[PDB]
Structures are given as C-alpha cells and as structure tokens.
Amino acid sequence: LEPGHAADQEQAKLIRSAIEHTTLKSVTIASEIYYDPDPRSTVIPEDEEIIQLHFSLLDEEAEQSFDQQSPWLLRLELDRAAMNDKDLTMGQVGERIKQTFKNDLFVIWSEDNDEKLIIRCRVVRPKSLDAETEAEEDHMLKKIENTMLENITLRGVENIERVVMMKYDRKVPSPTGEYVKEPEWVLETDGVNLSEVMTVPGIDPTRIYTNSFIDIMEVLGIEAGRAALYKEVYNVIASDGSYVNYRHMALLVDVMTTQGGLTSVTRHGFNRSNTGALM
Amino acid sequence: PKDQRATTPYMTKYERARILGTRALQISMNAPVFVDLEGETDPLRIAMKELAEKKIPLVIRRYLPDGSFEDWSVEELIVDL
Amino acid sequence: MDQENERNISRLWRAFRTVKEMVKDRGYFITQEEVELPLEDFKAKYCDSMGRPQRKMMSFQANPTEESISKFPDMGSLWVEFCDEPSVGVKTMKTFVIHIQEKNFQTGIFVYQNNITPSAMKLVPSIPPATIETFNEAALVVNITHHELVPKHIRLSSDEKRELLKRYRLKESQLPRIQRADPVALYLGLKRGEVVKIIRKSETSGRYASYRICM
Amino acid sequence: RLVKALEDIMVHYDNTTRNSLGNVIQFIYGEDGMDAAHIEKQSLDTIGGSDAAFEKRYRVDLLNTDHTLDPSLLESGSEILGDLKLQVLLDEEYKQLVKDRKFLREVFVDGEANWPLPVNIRRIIQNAQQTFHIDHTKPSDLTIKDIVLGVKDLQENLLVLRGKNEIIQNAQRDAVTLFCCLLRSRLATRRVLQEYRLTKQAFDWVLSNIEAQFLRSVVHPGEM
C-alpha cells in the first residue's frame, strides 16, 4: 500500500475489495425461470412486495413500454451473508448487470433490508414485445443466465482470486536515524495480473512484486525480470536456511537473461543457441 | 601489445601449476638445471626451488578473448601464492 | 464511477504525467512544473465542463535540450498526440502520418485508447527517416521505470558505443542483448544497434554498470 | 542441466566473464571481481546507529568543544588544536563518511550491516595490536594528515582492473565501492585513535597487509 495508507486497516480492506475478483455466481443461491405473463404484477405473492416497491418507481416512469417485458421471469435469489462479506449491495450488482445489459434486460431490484435478495429480470425483444409479453424462447433466458453467472465481473481484477491481507514488519529509518520495525499492511493474492493491479489507485506501484518472474519481465523489462528471477532463486535456495554465494546465482540469472529474454536451461533454451555444434 | 599490458602482474594459480609441471617434465627429461641443486631429487621440488629464485626461462602467453596476447616472463610475474 | 467521473480522469492525468516524464528522460526539454501537474489543474486546463477532456488539447511538442543536442546532434523535434477514437482505424493513422510528414517532425508518439488495427499498424514505418511510436494509454498509467527492481537505463552515443567496443574488444553481438519490444526499450525509444548503459546497485560492490544492445 | 548450461563460462584475463563464443556474460566476475573463497562476512558500521551516535563515533573537531579530539591521543594532540588545514581534512573525511552512510542506506534498504567482503579488517587490526604490543596508555605518534593520506593512497591501490583508459578506470572504481566504504567506516581517524590506539608503524603495517590481502583475494583468470 501507499506510505500514507499502509499503517491503517480499513484502507487496506478497500484495496482488497478493489482487487479481489468476485462474480454473481459467488453470491447467488439459486436461479429460477418462472412463468408470469403479467408484466406489471405477478401470480407469486412472495415477489409482490418487491414488485410494488418498484411498481411506484419503475412502472411509474415515463414512456412505459412492454418491449422489455416478457412472460418469463429470471428470478435470482442472492446470499445476504456473501454480499455482506464482499461489501456488495443490490446497487453494485444491478448497475454491473445494466452495464452488461444496457438495454437488453429489464432488471428489478430488491431492497437491501429485504430478507429476499431478488433480481427480477425479463427478456428484451423490441418489435415483438412492444405491447405484449410474447413467450420468448427459454433458451434465451438460459444463455442470459450463463452470461450473468460467468461473464459478469462485479468487482476486482480478472484472474485475481482471494486476496489475503496480512501484516508483517519492515525496517525503516527512525527520525533519529535508527532502523525500527514499522508494521505494514499488504495484500497477497492468487493469480498474476500485474498489468492491471499496478494501475489500481491506493497501491504503491514502485514496490509491487510477484513470484512469476515472466510477468515481471513482460511488464518491467529484462532487467527487472533478471532481478525477480534472482530473487526467486534466492528464495528457493534459502527456504532451507542454507545459502550459496551471491556470485553463483547472479551468474546463473545473468546467463539466463543475456539474450534480452528469459532462456530456460532445457533443450529449448541454452541448447538452441549459436554455440558450437559439438558443444 | 609490447607495453600497456593490462593483465595482472601476479602469476595466477593455474600459471604456477603449469609452470611447475612443465619444469618438472623438462628436468625429468634431463633438461639443464639453472639453479644450485642442493641434493634435491624430485623434479617437482627442483622446479619449485628454481621458481623461488626466478630461474625458470619460460614465459607465459596470455590470450585475450579477441585473440591478442601478452608475453609475460616468469621473472616479471610476482609469485604471491 | 462514470467515464466523466474521476475514475477515468485520474487515469488520463497519470498517463499524461507518465508521457511527460518519458519525453523528459529521452533528452527533450520539459520543465519540472509540467511533470507535476495537479489533478485539479489538469481538469481545469483540459477536462471539459461536461467532464470529457479534449484529448486533442493535450497534444504536445518537445525539443531537444542543449546537452542532448550537443551529445546527439541528430535529435529532432517530438510530437505527441492523444487520439480521440477508441479504435484507431487506418484513417486516423494516415492523418497522423500526414501531419508528421508535413510538420517535418523527426519523431512522433501516438498514444491510443484501446487498440490499433493491423492495417493502421502497417503505416508506422511508412515515413522514413521519421519514426512513429505507439503507446497504449493503459500501459502509460504507471511509469514502470520508477519501479524498485528496474535500474537506471542510459543511452550511449555512437561515439560512446564505439569507445566501449574498442576498450572491451567486443563485436556488436558480444554484448548482452535487449529486445526492441522491451518495455524500457520502448520507454527510451531505442533503435536497433543503440547500446544502453545499465547501472545497478550490486550487493558485492556498491554499483555495477553493465550494457545491452538493442535487437 | 545446470552444468551443461554454464559449462563454458570462464573468467578471462581482461577480468570479464564470457562463454565459448566470447559473448560477455558479465563485465567483471561477481560484479566485483573477487572469488568466493576469499570473501567472508563483515559489518558495515555506517549503515546502523543514530545520527548522534554516528557523529560521536566518527566526527572529529579540532576547533569547537562539541567533539574535541582529546590531546592525549596523539604525541602532538595539543599542537593540532586550530590548524584550519587539519580541520578541513577532517571535515572532508566526515563528509565522505556521510556520503557513504547515505549510499549504503540506499543500497541496503533494510539496513542489514553484515555482508560478505574480501578482506577481514578486524583480524588485521587485532594482529597489528598483538604483534606490536601496542600500549593503550601511550599517546600514539600518528598525525591526522598521515592517517588521511595513507587511507586515500590505499584506496588508490585497490586495483582490480589495470586498464589505462577511462572506461576501465570507471569500472575499477565502481568495483571497489563497497570495500572502500568498509575501509572508510573502519579506518576513521577517531576510531584509529580512540578505539584502536595504533602507532604509525602499526598503521603502515595494517595498510600494507590490507593491500596485499585483497590483492591475493582477486579472482584468477582461467577460473571455470
């Protein structure tokens, strides 16, 4: 984290929320397709209160049309505990769905306080539904459900799974000049997306690091790739306490990174080089 | 390069090993002995004795990666090993 | 946060700062004040009253410093243009190329939003001796050269490169290599055959200078 | 796999490291030209310690009373009081030590002070004391100018690369940055007069031994 936000707690949580990848499938309990020709009301008393909540809000809007109204209801019931854990509200998920479905899916919202986190959705098909809830093919709704549960990134960075915030100490010069341990809060993630996570506000981009030195090479260059490769080799060798002199691992990484790219020690790397044929 | 030789003035470990080996081989082959042999018998020990006195005629040609070289006489080189 | 919201204006401003720093490091004259433009000042100067900055107004021209031209007497003027179209069609690239050709700019940087079509990409080497560099705004959001791992890269003049090769008795091939597509190579705008001095803070010795040749 | 990959890399007589094609892997072995066998862990004093402690341990002032050099530490300690020339030399020394402190704190962000280095100077000074039976109650005959010039000459004699041009000279000066830092931290005038009450003979012996020892420590061309 940035120097001005590292010492604190909740800002680290905000960074965690900004990075961690989360989709609807992680918070949805079940998805159900229901038959309901009525576009303004329902035969289901359970959703009647939710419809009435938005009946005075959505159905009261100007330019009412049934082009977005269908007899099929794609009713998703979310998990209150999961949404609370991810700090997600019906708002965020709703406008993400809208972003993915700007005008191809009419979406109704349930009040956050309601015990039934419901996303009442209807198919959209202009020129056929304009003034009727024609029976749209259910497979269309099933494809829509697939897109929602797979292709909707509610919040976070793609390929970044659970982000584990933790504290450990770093030595920084005290104003008296002595090196003192200043507790710091960082995040350790899964999957690498440096190219995006670097740009996220609130993170110190000059200190970000990853164990996948290939991505370090791709984003920061061959010199940063070489340094990261040396760091990885040092970690591997010192995991057991025993250490080797800096020169040996430095020479190894230098050899691996002389050609402006990461060369392996396989038959695809150093072996496919310009050296002698008998060698 | 007859001067401005940029190589180390100290005889290296491998240079010492090969100089002693060459002189031992030559003495074993009944080559002339340049020092006052003090009853010594082992060719390697004689070679060490006459290296201590800088009485080995041989020189050392030091090749550089570009192919050039420098001619250093064992009399010039400093045996700090 | 909508596009007009700070979520995008901040990224645009950071990319602007990165571009200014990159051009400054190349040897061109840029006042330190321009590099440290505050976000509010950037919005006042560029962001519209509607929250939609006029990217055409961020276009930028830089000229070599006295020392840079003294050391690199071949250096010319630089032109930097932030395109408006999300997708860079061949027409926009053609217009930019014509502008560079008619202004007689030695070098020009083209910062784009999302992508450049291959047809447009084919126009990059179409105006020698002038060269055209293309950058993605996403890439420029963070100045990678400020990373802790990344060391300091310094470009050598042809005379410096010749002296280096003479003193180490090297050939162009016997130096360590750096690819053209290397992020730092793109940042410095290296051409093929330009050797780069790299100064690292070695663990065994205080500092250690190595070199790489663009390939 | 590893042995085959690095099989043909050798240190050449120009002190660079190259493979069988002559390509340069690194322009000096290990980035300092010393072989691992002769390195051993040593402490870098300047990195740690508070500013006040650093100044007390290193700063020496002949003019003011804040950090006066006790006259009992030199056979001419009383005379040196004043002497703006000696004060200028000592101020230059302290500025160099401050620069070394900042540079090392840049190099080692975490402040670690124990790092392998070729010549073990602690043992050299212990040997000097034991050999010369140096008395800690007798004001040493050293002089500030002698100490400073001797240390500077030694630094000048820290030869790894012996080229005559400017590229090789820059490389050689870089290659001895950290060892020079260790020397300056360890052979400060204040330390050489208070902590190690050496005489002129012992100081010359220490400098000569350091010279010889790291000269023996440099890597041998031909090393595989």
Curated annotation (Swiss-Prot), chain B:
Q: Where is this region: Leucine-zipper?
A: 37-58
Any Gene Ontology biological process: transcription initiation at RNA polymerase I promoter
Name the predominant localization: cytoplasm
* Function recorded in the entry: DNA-dependent RNA polymerases catalyze the transcription of DNA into RNA using the four ribonucleoside triphosphates as substrates. Common component of RNA polymerases I, II and III which synthesize ribosomal RNA precursors, mRNA precursors and many functional non-coding RNAs, and small RNAs, such as 5S rRNA and tRNAs, respectively. Pol II is the central component of the basal RNA polymerase II transcription machinery. RNA polymerases are composed of mobile elements that move relative to each other.
Q: Which family does it belong to?
A: Belongs to the archaeal Rpo6/eukaryotic RPB6 RNA polymerase subunit family.
Subunit comment for this entry?
A: Component of the RNA polymerase I (Pol I), RNA polymerase II (Pol II) and RNA polymerase III (Pol III) complexes. Component of the RNA polymerase I (Pol I) complex consisting of 14 subunits: RPA135, RPA190, RPC40, RPA14, RPB5, RPO26, RPA43, RPB8, RPA12, RPB10, RPC19, RPC10, RPA49 and RPA34. The complex is composed of a horseshoe-shaped core containing ten subunits (RPA135, RPA190, RPB5, RPO26, RPB8, RPB10, RPC10, RPA12, RPC19 and RPC40) where RPA135 and RPA190 form the DNA-binding cleft.
Name this polypeptide is given: DNA-directed RNA polymerases I, II, and III subunit RPABC2
Provenance organism: Saccharomyces cerevisiae (strain ATCC 204508 / S288c) (Baker's yeast)
Shown stretch of the complete protein: 75 to 155 of 155
Swiss-Prot record, chain D:
Q: Which domain of life is it from?
A: Eukaryota
Show which stretch of the intact protein is covered: 840 to 1063 of 1733
Family membership = Belongs to the RNA polymerase beta' chain family.
Gene that this polypeptide is encoded by? RPO21
Q: What is this protein called?
A: DNA-directed RNA polymerase II subunit RPB1
The listed locations are:
Nucleus
Q: How does it assemble?
A: Component of the RNA polymerase II (Pol II) complex consisting of 12 subunits. Interacts with DEF1; the interaction is direct and serves to bridge RPB1 to the Elongin complex in a DNA-damaged dependent manner. Interacts with the Elongin subunit ELA1. Interacts with the Elongin subunit ELC1. Interacts with ASK10. Interacts with ESS1. Interacts with RTT103. Interacts with SHE2.
Q: What is known of its domains?
A: The C-terminal domain (CTD) serves as a platform for assembly of factors that regulate transcription initiation, elongation, termination and mRNA processing.
Q: Which residues form a coiled coil?
A: none
The extra comment attached to this record reads: Mutagenesis experiments demonstrate that the minimum viable CTD contains eight consensus Y-S-P-T-S-P-[A-S-N-G] heptapeptide repeats. Identical and simultaneous substitutions in a number of consecutive repeats are lethal: 'Ser-2' -> 'Ala-2' (14 repeats), 'Ser-5' -> 'Ala-5' (15 repeats), '2-Ser-Pro-Thr-Ser-5'-> '2-Ala-Pro-Thr-Ala-5' (10 repeats), 'Ser-2'-> 'Glu-2' (15 repeats), 'Ser-5' -> 'Glu-5' (12 repeats), '2-Ser-Pro-3' -> '2-Pro-Ser-3' (15 repeats) and 'Tyr-1' -> 'Phe-1' (12 repeats).
Q: Could you describe the post-translational modifications of this protein?
A: The tandem 7 residues repeats in the C-terminal domain (CTD) can be highly phosphorylated. The phosphorylation activates Pol II. Phosphorylation occurs mainly at residues 'Ser-2' and 'Ser-5' of the heptapeptide repeat. The phosphorylated form of Pol II appears to carry, on average, one phosphate per repeat. The phosphorylation state is believed to result from the balanced action of site-specific CTD kinases and phosphatases, and a 'CTD code' that specifies the position of Pol II within the transcription cycle has been proposed.
**Reported function:** DNA-dependent RNA polymerase catalyzes the transcription of DNA into RNA using the four ribonucleoside triphosphates as substrates. Largest and catalytic component of RNA polymerase II which synthesizes mRNA precursors and many functional non-coding RNAs. Forms the polymerase active center together with the second largest subunit. Pol II is the central component of the basal RNA polymerase II transcription machinery. During a transcription cycle, Pol II, general transcription factors and the Mediator complex assemble as the preinitiation complex (PIC) at the promoter.
Q: Which organism is it from?
A: Saccharomyces cerevisiae (strain ATCC 204508 / S288c)
